[PDB]
């Protein structure tokens, strides 16, 4: 290891993933297993990569105190055990799901998704992101307007209104 010369290191070096941070997630991992690194690191194979890091650095005094790069409301955002996660390339979508559709399956606590940066707020997960590049969600998103949204009601008077 090393003192300040090493402490400062883990800081700025990784805090760069905060200044120029794509997405953002804070998940504790009490009772985490190796699959913990056989997942966010496995999905990094044929659907991710070295573009993701969850360097458990909840040293707070290091992680939290180490975020002068504007991330207010975080003097609270850094409680107990933590394992921050950030992105560099790619979009700012998916990622939340790697956690949302993993930790939801036991896989240790998920900090109930305390939310992180980007919009900069508090706790209460969202998902308006992973719907990206799933353009067909913007396709049927018109609900055929005329069609479907019609053949669903304007023609429901027959299979549900003839008495």
């Amino acid at each position: 290891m090393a003192l300040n010369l090493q402490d400062k290191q883990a800081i700025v070096a990784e805090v760069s993933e905060v200044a120029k941070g794509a997405l953002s997630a804070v998940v504790a991992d009490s009772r985490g297993v190796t699959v913990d690194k056989m997942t966010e690191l496995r999905k990094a194979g044929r659907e991710a990569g070295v573009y993701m890091r969850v360097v458990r650095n909840t040293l707070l005094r290091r992680a939290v105190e180490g975020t002068p790069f504007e991330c207010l409301k975080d003097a609270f955002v850094g409680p107990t055990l933590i394992a921050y996660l950030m992105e560099h390339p790619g979009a700012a979508a998916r990622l939340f799901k790697e956690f949302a559709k993993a930790n939801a399956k036991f896989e240790v606590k998920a900090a109930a998704f305390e939310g992180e940066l980007i919009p900069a707020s508090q706790i209460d997960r969202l998902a308006t992101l992973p719907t990206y590049e799933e353009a067909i969600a913007r396709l049927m998103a018109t609900m055929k307007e005329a069609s479907a949204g019609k053949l669903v009601r304007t023609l429901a008077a027959v299979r549900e209104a003839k008495e």
Binding site: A135, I136, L139, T142, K144, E145, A146, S147
Partner: peptide
């Protein structure tokens, strides 16, 4: 960009034209 009350009112396209704007709104795909 942000062309509000138009990209919408273009619904004059009517049904078959919307399937025309969807067939290709992906065409050459899955």
């Amino acid at each position: 960009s942000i062309t509000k009350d138009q990209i919408i009112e273009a619904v004059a396209a009517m049904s078959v034209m919307d399937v025309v704007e969807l067939i290709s709104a992906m065409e050459e795909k899955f």
